[PDB]
Short mmCIF file of all heavy atoms in Angstrom, two decimals:
data_model
loop_
_atom_site.label_atom_id
_atom_site.label_comp_id
_atom_site.label_asym_id
_atom_site.label_seq_id
_atom_site.Cartn_x
_atom_site.Cartn_y
_atom_site.Cartn_z
N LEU A 62 63.83 40.02 143.73
CA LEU A 62 62.38 39.85 143.78
C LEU A 62 61.92 38.46 144.12
O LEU A 62 61.45 37.64 143.17
CB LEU A 62 61.70 40.40 142.52
CG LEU A 62 60.22 40.73 142.42
CD1 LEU A 62 59.86 41.75 143.52
CD2 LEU A 62 59.81 41.06 141.10
N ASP A 63 62.27 37.92 145.34
CA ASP A 63 62.09 36.57 145.68
C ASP A 63 61.13 36.28 146.57
O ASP A 63 60.49 35.26 146.76
CB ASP A 63 63.43 36.06 145.95
CG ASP A 63 63.69 34.51 145.81
OD1 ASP A 63 62.61 33.84 145.31
OD2 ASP A 63 64.70 33.96 146.02
N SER A 64 60.82 37.30 147.69
CA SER A 64 59.74 37.17 148.49
C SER A 64 58.48 37.37 147.66
O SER A 64 57.39 36.79 148.13
CB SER A 64 59.81 38.32 149.54
OG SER A 64 60.99 38.16 150.38
N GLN A 65 58.50 38.02 146.53
CA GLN A 65 57.40 37.98 145.71
C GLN A 65 57.19 36.54 145.12
O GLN A 65 55.99 36.15 145.10
CB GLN A 65 57.69 38.89 144.40
CG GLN A 65 57.91 40.32 144.70
CD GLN A 65 59.22 40.72 145.23
OE1 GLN A 65 60.21 39.96 145.30
NE2 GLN A 65 59.46 42.10 145.43
N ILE A 66 58.21 35.74 144.96
CA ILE A 66 58.00 34.37 144.40
C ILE A 66 57.35 33.40 145.62
O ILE A 66 56.35 32.82 145.38
CB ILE A 66 59.27 33.66 144.19
CG1 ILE A 66 60.04 34.57 143.08
CG2 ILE A 66 59.24 32.31 143.72
CD1 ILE A 66 59.48 34.60 141.73
N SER A 67 57.90 33.71 146.80
CA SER A 67 57.35 32.82 147.94
C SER A 67 55.89 33.19 148.19
O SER A 67 54.99 32.37 148.39
CB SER A 67 58.25 33.04 149.17
OG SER A 67 57.69 32.42 150.24
N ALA A 68 55.60 34.54 148.21
CA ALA A 68 54.17 34.92 148.51
C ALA A 68 53.29 34.70 147.39
O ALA A 68 52.03 34.42 147.64
CB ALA A 68 54.20 36.37 148.82
N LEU A 69 53.85 34.55 146.17
CA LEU A 69 52.99 34.34 145.05
C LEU A 69 52.59 32.92 144.97
O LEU A 69 51.56 32.42 144.43
CB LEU A 69 53.55 34.88 143.72
CG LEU A 69 53.76 36.33 143.57
CD1 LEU A 69 54.69 36.66 142.33
CD2 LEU A 69 52.42 37.02 143.49
N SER A 70 53.50 32.05 145.50
CA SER A 70 53.16 30.57 145.64
C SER A 70 52.15 30.44 146.91
O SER A 70 51.30 29.59 146.74
CB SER A 70 54.44 29.80 145.81
OG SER A 70 55.33 29.94 144.75
N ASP A 71 52.35 31.24 147.80
CA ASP A 71 51.44 31.07 149.07
C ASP A 71 50.13 31.63 148.84
O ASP A 71 49.25 31.30 149.62
CB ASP A 71 52.29 31.77 150.22
CG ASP A 71 51.66 31.21 151.52
OD1 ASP A 71 50.95 30.37 151.63
OD2 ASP A 71 52.10 31.85 152.65
N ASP A 72 49.98 32.42 147.80
CA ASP A 72 48.61 33.12 147.58
C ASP A 72 47.69 32.17 146.85
O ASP A 72 46.44 32.06 146.98
CB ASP A 72 48.97 34.54 146.99
CG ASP A 72 47.52 35.18 146.74
OD1 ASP A 72 46.90 35.56 147.80
OD2 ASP A 72 47.11 35.48 145.57
N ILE A 73 48.38 31.57 145.80
CA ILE A 73 47.54 30.61 144.92
C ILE A 73 47.20 29.33 145.59
O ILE A 73 46.21 28.58 145.21
CB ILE A 73 48.21 30.44 143.59
CG1 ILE A 73 49.43 29.55 143.82
CG2 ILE A 73 48.59 31.74 142.98
CD1 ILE A 73 50.20 29.10 142.54
N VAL A 74 47.72 28.91 146.65
CA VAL A 74 47.52 27.72 147.38
C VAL A 74 46.19 27.86 148.15
O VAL A 74 45.49 26.89 148.40
CB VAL A 74 48.65 27.28 148.30
CG1 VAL A 74 48.88 28.16 149.43
CG2 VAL A 74 48.57 25.82 148.64
#
Side-chain angles (χ1 to χ4, degrees):
Chain A
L62 193 62
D63 203 0
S64 297
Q65 295 85 0
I66 306 291
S67 178
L69 295 174
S70 298
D71 199 7
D72 181 65
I73 64 170
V74 71

